[PDB]
Each structure stands twice: as structure tokens, then as C-alpha cells.
Amino acid sequence: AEYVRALFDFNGNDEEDLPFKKGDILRIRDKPEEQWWNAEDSEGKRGMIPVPYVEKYR
């Protein structure tokens, strides 16, 4: 129910991060801190993403 869209590629630094490509659509799964959220990609992969790299999607 909450999706965002990537504004920039993100490649992670840690294994726990979720890489993505500019324009990718992600589902938010948890918001443990303000700037880093847990998300799921179209493939079902999960990991942390940086909030400033995304925008609300639809």
C-alpha cells in the first residue's frame, strides 16, 4: 500500500541495503528511522533504502 519511485540509482554499501535503479518502484515495508526504510523491489527482494533517493509513487 505505500510505494515510492527511485529518483537516482542506489547501489548500497552494506549487504543489508537494497540496491535499485533510477525509476524503479519499491514497496515500503518498515520505517525504523527517518532516512532509511526497509523496502521490497519488484523481484521480492528486501533491504534498506535511503529516503532522499525516492519520491512517493501514485
Partner: peptide, 15 residues
């Protein structure tokens, strides 16, 4: 003439 990737925000916690 595009903007660069933003500075990655620091993580408050470990995941």
C-alpha cells in the same frame, strides 16, 4: 547537465 546523486544520509542505526 544533470544533478548528482545525493549525499547518502547517515544511518542512525545498524540493520
Amino acid at each position: 547537465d544533470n544533478s548528482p546523486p545525493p549525499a547518502l544520509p547517515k544511518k542512525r542505526q545498524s540493520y
